[PDB]
Structure formats: C-alpha cells, structure tokens
Amino acid sequence: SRRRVVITGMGMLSPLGLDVPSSWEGILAGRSGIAPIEHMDLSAYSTRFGGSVKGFNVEEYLSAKEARKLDLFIQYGLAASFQAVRDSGLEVTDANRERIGVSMGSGIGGLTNIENNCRSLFEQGPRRISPFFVPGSIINMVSGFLSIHLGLQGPNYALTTAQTTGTHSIGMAARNIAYGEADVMVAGGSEMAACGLGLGGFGAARALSTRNDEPTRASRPWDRDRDGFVLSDGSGALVLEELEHARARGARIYAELVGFGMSGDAFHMTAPPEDGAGAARCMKNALRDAGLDPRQVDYINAHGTSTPAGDIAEIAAVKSVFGEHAHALSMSSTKSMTGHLLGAAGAVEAIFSVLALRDQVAPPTINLDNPDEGCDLDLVAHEAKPRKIDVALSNSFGFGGTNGTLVFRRFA
Amino acid sequence: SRRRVVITGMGMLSPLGLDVPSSWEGILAGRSGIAPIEHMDLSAYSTRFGGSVKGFNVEEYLSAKEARKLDLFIQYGLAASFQAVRDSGLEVTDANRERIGVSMGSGIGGLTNIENNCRSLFEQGPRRISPFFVPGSIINMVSGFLSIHLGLQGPNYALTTAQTTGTHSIGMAARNIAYGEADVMVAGGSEMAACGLGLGGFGAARALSTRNDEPTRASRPWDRDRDGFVLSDGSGALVLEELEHARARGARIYAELVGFGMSGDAFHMTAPPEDGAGAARCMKNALRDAGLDPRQVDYINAHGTSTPAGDIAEIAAVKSVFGEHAHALSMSSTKSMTGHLLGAAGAVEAIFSVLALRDQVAPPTINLDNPDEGCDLDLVAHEAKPRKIDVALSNSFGFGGTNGTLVFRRFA
Numbered sequence: 001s002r003r004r005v006v007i008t009g010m011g012m013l014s015p016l017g018l019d020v021p022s023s024w025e026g027i028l029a030g031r032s033g034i035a036p037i038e039h040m041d042l043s044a045y046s047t048r049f050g051g052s053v054k055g056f057n058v059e060e061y062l063s064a065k066e067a068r069k070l071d072l073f074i075q076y077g078l079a080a081s082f083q084a085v086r087d088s089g090l091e092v093t094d095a096n097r098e099r100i101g102v103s104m105g106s107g108i109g110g111l112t113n114i115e116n117n118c119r120s121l122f123e124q125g126p127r128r129i130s131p132f133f134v135p136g137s138i139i140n141m142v143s144g145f146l147s148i149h150l151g152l153q154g155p156n157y158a159l160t161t162a163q164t165t166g167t168h169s170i171g172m173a174a175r176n177i178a179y180g181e182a183d184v185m186v187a188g189g190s191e192m193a194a195c196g197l198g199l200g201g202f203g204a205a206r207a208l209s210t211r212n213d214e215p216t217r218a219s220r221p222w223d224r225d226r227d228g229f230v231l232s233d234g235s236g237a238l239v240l241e242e243l244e245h246a247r248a249r250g251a252r253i254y255a256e257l258v259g260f261g262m263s264g265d266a267f268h269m270t271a272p273p274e275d276g277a278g279a280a281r282c283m284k285n286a287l288r289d290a291g292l293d294p295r296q297v298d299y300i301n302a303h304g305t306s307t308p309a310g311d312i313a314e315i316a317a318v319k320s321v322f323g324e325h326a327h328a329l330s331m332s333s334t335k336s337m338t339g340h341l342l343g344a345a346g347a348v349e350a351i352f353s354v355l356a357l358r359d360q361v362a363p364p365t366i367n368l369d370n371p372d373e374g375c376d377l378d379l380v381a382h383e384a385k386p387r388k389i390d391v392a393l394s395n396s397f398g399f400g401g402t403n404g405t406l407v408f409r410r411f412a
Numbered sequence: 413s414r415r416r417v418v419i420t421g422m423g424m425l426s427p428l429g430l431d432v433p434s435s436w437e438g439i440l441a442g443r444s445g446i447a448p449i450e451h452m453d454l455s456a457y458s459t460r461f462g463g464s465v466k467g468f469n470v471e472e473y474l475s476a477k478e479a480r481k482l483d484l485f486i487q488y489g490l491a492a493s494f495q496a497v498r499d500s501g502l503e504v505t506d507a508n509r510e511r512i513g514v515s516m517g518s519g520i521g522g523l524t525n526i527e528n529n530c531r532s533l534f535e536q537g538p539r540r541i542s543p544f545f546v547p548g549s550i551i552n553m554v555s556g557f558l559s560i561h562l563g564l565q566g567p568n569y570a571l572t573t574a575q576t577t578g579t580h581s582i583g584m585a586a587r588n589i590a591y592g593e594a595d596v597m598v599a600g601g602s603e604m605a606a607c608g609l610g611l612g613g614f615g616a617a618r619a620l621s622t623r624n625d626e627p628t629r630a631s632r633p634w635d636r637d638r639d640g641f642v643l644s645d646g647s648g649a650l651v652l653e654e655l656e657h658a659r660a661r662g663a664r665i666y667a668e669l670v671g672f673g674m675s676g677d678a679f680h681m682t683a684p685p686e687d688g689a690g691a692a693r694c695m696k697n698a699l700r701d702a703g704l705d706p707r708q709v710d711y712i713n714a715h716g717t718s719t720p721a722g723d724i725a726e727i728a729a730v731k732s733v734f735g736e737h738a739h740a741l742s743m744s745s746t747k748s749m750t751g752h753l754l755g756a757a758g759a760v761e762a763i764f765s766v767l768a769l770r771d772q773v774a775p776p777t778i779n780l781d782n783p784d785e786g787c788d789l790d791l792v793a794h795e796a797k798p799r800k801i802d803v804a805l806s807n808s809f810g811f812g813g814t815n816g817t818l819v820f821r822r823f824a
C-alpha cells in the first residue's frame with residue numbers, strides 16, 4: 001500500500017507578486033506580470049521584455065552577508081520555501097527533523113552568477129572569481145541552505161528537468177512521503193534566467209516571443225498570432241505532508257496530491273510530437289496513479305507555453321486522453337499572465353491548481369483573441385470562470401521530451 | 413509491494429580508461445589518471461592538473477554533427493549510457509519501451525559550454541550565442557538525448573546534488589524500479605568541470621590540491637600531507653533492472669542493489685561536521701533499508717576526497733556506525749587514483765563497488781604514505797587486497813550537507 005499526501009503550506013515569488021495571495025489575486029484578475037526588463041542593456045537582443053520579480057527584498061529572509069553568497073535563483077527558492085514552511089505552521093523538532101526533507105529544483109541554475117564571474121574571469125583573470133562561486137551557483141543549494149537554516153535531516157536533493165523541474169520535484173517529494181521515506185517535504189523550483197545568457201540563449205533558438213511593442217500581449221497560448229514563450233523569473237514551494245501527520249497537529253489542508261505521472265516523448269531535443277503522444281501517456285499514467293477515470297478531471301493547468309508546436313500538442317493530448325469529456329473540463333494557461341518560469345513553472349502552476357480547488361474558479365487564458373485551428377476546447381479565454389472543481393491536473397513538458405503531471409483533489 | 417533490483421550493465425569514462433574493463437585494470441594496478449591539464453593555459457591558476465578523459469572519440473557513439481551541439485559532460489554521459497545498455501544485452505521494443513527510463517545527473521553540467529557562449533556574448537554580442545546553448549548545456553539532456561536515441565519512454569529525469577549526484581541518481585532510479593514505476597533504468601552521472609570557472613571557482617574556495625609539481629601524488633585520502641581534492645572528468649552509467657525481469661530474459665547479473673540511504677547534515681554549505689554525524693545517519697538508513705547486520709559489510713568505497721575535514725569525518729562516521737567491525741572491514745578511496753569526478757564520482761564508484769564484489773578484491777588507496785591522526789582502519793594503503801566481499805557500501809557527501817549511501821551484495 002501507500003500513505004496519503006496533502007498540501008499544508010505554499011510559498012511563491014512570481015511576476016504577479018511577492019507571495020501566493022498577491023500572485024493569485026493577479027491570476028484571477030487576468031493581470032499580466034510582463035514588462036520590458038530594467039537595469040540591463042537589451043539593445044542587441046531580439047526580446048527586451050519578460051516576467052521579472054518586482055520589489056524582492058532578500059533581507060526579509062537572509063542577512064545581506066549570506067544573500068551576497070547566493071545566486072538570485074537560490075534567493076528566490078529560499079523565499080518561497082521559508083513562506084511555505086511558515087504557511088504550514090510546522091514545528092521542526094529533534095523528534096521529527098530526520099523525517100523532514102527538501103527537493104527544490106531549477107531548470108537552468110546560476111546563469112546570472114556564472115555571467116558576472118565570467119566578466120571578472122575574462123577582464124581580470126581567475127583570482128577575481130568569488131570563493132562562493134560554486135556553492136553559491138549550484139542547483140542543490142536551495143535544498144542545502146534550507147536544510148541548514150531549519151535543521152532538516154530528511155531526504156535532501158534537487159531535480160533539474162528543464163521546464164518540468166517544479167512538477168517532477170513535487171511529484172517525487174510526494175512519492176518520498178507515500179512510500180514512508182519522509183513525513184514532510186518542501187518541494188518545488190526556482191528560476192532566474194533573464195540574463196544575457198537566458199535571453200540570448202533562448203533568443204538564438206528563436207524560442208522567444210519578439211512582440212517588444214506589446215509585452216503584456218506576447219504570451220498568448222492557443223492564439224493564432226503566438227510567436228513563442230515569454231521568459232519569467234520566480235519560485236514556488238509546497239509543504240507536502242503525510243495525512244495522518246497533518247491531522248494529528250491540526251494542519252490546514254489545502255488539497256490532496258492523489259496522482260503523479262512521468263513519461264519521456266523520446267521524440268526531439270526541444271520540440272514535442274505534434275499529436276502530444278508524450279503528454280497523453282504522462283496524463284494517463286498520472287490518472288492511473290490516482291485510481292481516477294479521465295471523466296473525473298474538472299480543471300487542467302496546461303503547460304501552455306505559447307510556442308506554435310507546444311500549444312497544439314497539448315490540445316491533441318487532452319482530446320486523446322479525455323475523448324467525449326475533453327470539452328467538459330476547463331483548461332487554461334496561467335503562463336498567459338506569468339509567462340514561463342521554466343523550472344519554477346510547475347511549482348507556481350501546482351499552487352494555482354490547488355487554489356483553483358480551494359476557490360472553485362478556473363484561471364483565465366488571457367490574450368486568447370483568435371483560437372488557432374483545432375483549439376476549440378474550453379480554454380477559459382480572457383476571464384476567470386467559477387465552476388465545480390473536484391480534480392485538477394497540472395502538466396509540464398520540457399526539453400528532452402520530459403513530461404510531468406500532478407493530480408490534486410479537493411480534501412474534506 | 414517492493415521489488416528487488418540488480419545490475420545487468422555498466423559503462424564508464426574515467427581518467428584511467430574509456431570503458432569499465434580498462435578503468436578497472438588501472439584501479440587494481442594502483443595507476444593514477446592525474447596529470448597536468450593540456451586543453452587550456454592554466455599558468456594564472458593555483459591548480460594546473462586534474463583527471464582528464466584521455467583520447468575520448470565521440471564518433472564511437474554520435475555523429476560529429478550532433479556531438480558539436482553538446483557539452484562534453486553530455487557526450488561523456490551518453491558514452492557511458494550507450495556502453496551500459498550494450499553491456500546489459502537489453503533490447504528496447506514497443507512492448508517494454510514505456511517501462512525503461514533514465515536518470516543521469518551532473519553537479520555543475522555544461523560549464524565549458526556556458527563559458528564559451530559567455531565569451532561570445534561579452535566579446536561579440538548575443539547574436540553569436542549558439543542556438544544549441546540551452547539544450548546543449550542543461551543537466552537533464554543526458555536523460556533526454558539518451559531517451560531520444562534509444563526510444564526510452566519510462567521516467568525521464570536528472571538529479572543535481574553536487575558531489576552526491578551519482579549515488580542519489582542510482583539510488584532513486586532503484587526506488588523507481590522497487591516501487592513499479594519502471595522495470596529498467598539507466599542511471600549514474602557525468603561531469604566535465606575542467607574549464608576556467610571550474611578550476612578558478614574551486615581554486616577561489618581553496619578546495620583543490622595545489623601539488624602542481626607532482627600531480628599523481630596530489631590525491632592522498634587520509635594522508636597527513638593532503639591539501640584538497642583533485643578535479644576529474646568522466647561518466648558512470650548502470651543498467652538497473654527488476655530481478656524477475658532480469659531473470660525472465662536470462663540477463664547476466666553483476667550484483668544486487670539492496671540498500672539506499674539519504675540524509676542531510678543540516679550543518680554547513682560546504683564543510684562536513686568533524687564527527688561525520690550526517691554520513692553516519694545516511695549509512696544507518698542504507699543498512700536498515702538493506703535489512704542487514706552492519707557486521708555483514710566487507711568493503712566500503714569511501715567518498716575519500718583528500719580534504720582535511722572530509723576524510724576524517726568519514727573515519728568518525730565508519731567508527732560510529734560499525735563499532736569494533738570498523739577494524740574488520742576494508743575501506744578505500746579510488747579517488748586516490750581517479751580524482752574527484754564530482755557528480756560522476758558516485759556513478760564510477762558504484763561500478764568499482766560492484767567489481768569489488770565480482771572479483772573479490774578491495775581497490776587500493778594509493779599515496780597513503782602516513783595515515784593521519786585517528787585514520788587507523790584497514791584503508792588498503794598502496795596495493796589492491798584480495799578478500800571476501802559479500803556486501804559493499806559506496807558513500808558520497810556533497811555541498812549543502814547532502815549524503816548518499818548505496819549497498820550492493822553478491823547475487824547467486
């Protein structure tokens with residue numbers, strides 16, 4: 001058998017806000033977090049906008065001295081993690097510290113740090129490389145620093161599965177608790193790839209929307225005018241907890257994590273298969289994992305990245321998995337407002353999926369002015385839709401054809 | 413309910429050889445793979461030597477056209493993966509492809525590639541960034557490219573837990589099989605951090621041996637004259653397989669994976685606690701996981717990095733876990749010969765642990781001329797030691813206080 005896993009805490013930095021409730025308020029209002037990127041010369045770049053975290057004060061979390069040691073992506077993961085744990089009311093003790101672990105991930109890691117240390121290296125030589133360069137830049141330091149700050153002695157690791165990281169981190173954390181390896185896990189991802197390398201790298205692959213004139217309209221999933229994804233920064237963390245452990249201490253439970261799917265497309269390095277065969281297997285594996293019929297799904301938070309091939313693959317996949325239920329469920333892309341947080345996309349979108357359950361409302365896909373050929377599902381165009389939601393899926397599909405699906409269910 | 417997991421295939425690039433047999437011959441002969449680095453000008457650096465992979469021909473594996481797009485760490489991970497799958501004799505079919513996955517990890521990933529594109533960005537501009545920068549550098553693309561080349565549609569992911577990456581990758585892949593999420597996994601790690609940022613970054617932290625005038629004597633675990641670890645490159649991959657699946661197809665089985673342990677130190681970003689309390693918790697979790705008496709442990713493949721604090725912490729941990737049996741078992745560090753392959757360390761060392769079981773021999777700790785205060789166990793100084801090994805244990809410890817232990821035993 002297998003233990004049940006609930007969500008007792010959530011934390012977040014997004015382009016919509018510095019915590020969950022401010023972000024969610026943005027989501028439900030259909031507000032864009034997308035704007036031209038400030039403090040950074042993007043003159044020579046084909047993209048000049050994205051979703052930045054606005055007004056982030058790391059000294060709410062760390063001393064200036066400790067924060068100087070850590071890439072922005074680590075600072076963002078720590079913010080969300082500290083918010084989630086505090087949100088949970090959990091008390092770490094000598095009696096439970098060994099049963100509390102962390103799996104916070106990143107798709108791309110410490111590009112901003114790598115870039116600033118490259119500056120010093122090329123200009124002045126290696127003796128100007130920071131001593132904290134390595135531990136301050138590597139992806140497992142959100143899990144590392146979090147475990148040290150809070151005395152967490154349970155499983156300590158980090159996933160890096162590109163744009164699937166947040167979904168894989170939360171799902172595998174859920175398994176840890178299910179199979180009795182931990183009672184609590186902090187899980188999710190964080191990302192800050194708005195450097196020359198992030199913007200330039202994705203720009204060189206022409207993966208990015210170049211709609212510089214209207215940044216808030218750039219991210220337009222399933223719209224016939226979409227021209228690639230919008231690069232966004234931030235973090236999501238969830239406190240996952242064994243149900244009996246949660247009930248014993250009188251935890252507030254947001255929702256239950258009932259299902260987790262993984263699959264490989266084995267198709268292409270960056271492009272999904274047109275029929276979304278991969279996303280289809282992943283979702284079926286997730287629903288089998290939950291013991292649920294496709295007919296029981298009410299709400300899907302799409303990957304919905306606003307790439308030509310990605311959006312269409314996901315329509316094909318849902319139609320394949322859900323047959324005559326495909327029009328009944330609501331499916332929206334919150335990336336229409338947040339843009340694409342890469343490795344943190346699945347973390348924030350899991351939180352939005354959980355809040356859709358709490359509040360019985362499907363978030364909008366904004367900018368969906370002219371749905372493309374075959375995009376005739378209920379994609380919650382323009383405005384939040386109040387509706388019945390017992391079961392919510394969150395999908396992530398990343399480079400290497402790596403797929404992730406999470407199934408959350410109302411708890412009561 | 414929990415299924416058993418065996419090793420049916422192994423693959424490797426190391427500073428001692430371009431495969432497992434060649435590498436293993438060097439280990440038992442006590443040969444060093446450590447030499448001044450030839451691929452760049454290190455005269456401005458305080459460390460000028462490492463374990464390079466010598467004479468790697470990527471066109472034994474991949475088209476020059478595909479190889480040109482990929483960081484060496486990905487080329488190294490693919491090379492070891494292809495070797496391991498060939499060594500397993502497994503045939504991928506429509507019938508089984510959905511039950512075969514991959515978890516190949518890296519500590520740092522595509523740091524050379526990121527440096528090169530960073531140079532292009534700063535010297536020329538964003539328009540000279542490779543269109544393959546992202547899919548050619550990010551850590552999950554060993555798992556991705558492997559899945560694409562062989563058509564593996566099982567769980568597809570990557571860990572990044574610094575110097576623990578290979579041990580965790582293998583351990584968690586076994587759990588995937590144990591719990592029925594897959595019947596087969598290719599798992600391990602790859603690293604190529606021997607660029608300016610890598611040697612400069614570890615150099616800035618004063619973590620590396622500076623013995624530039626005698627590189628083969630640099631890596632000297634538990635020796636009183638040790639002065640840091642030696643940075644080495646390469647890859648380890650294992651085919652892990654549910655026992656009955658292996659039996660059904662008549663697979664040759666090298667050994668059984670009976671035990672996996674994880675723990676966080678929750679101590680320090682980069683330093684281990686002097687008493688090895690985190691390593692001790694991890695090894696105890698792994699032995700309890702294997703259903704063993706600690707006295708069954710015959711051979712330990714130590715982390716054994718040749719750092720002052722790391723080496724002694726591990727003595728403390730082994731004494732605390734094994735009591736008087738700490739004086740009966742044999743413990744060696746193959747890092748004495750290979751150097752520290754970082755995220756690949758746990759992968760090659762898992763392979764050396766399985767070959768200690770096959771060949772009934774403890775690999776030497778070379779350069780152990782003057783064991784330090786309290787380093788009074790059988791550390792197999794200087795020369796391989798033929799002996800009874802029924803149970804072998806492989807330890808890794810990383811930045812963020814992240815610990816991993818694998819337990820393997822003979823299968824008959």
Ligand SMILES: CC(=O)NCc1cn[nH]c1
Nearest residue numbers: 621622623624625626639
């Ligand atoms: C330049 C050189 O080889 N010096 C000797 C040494 C011993 N430990 N670290 C350095």
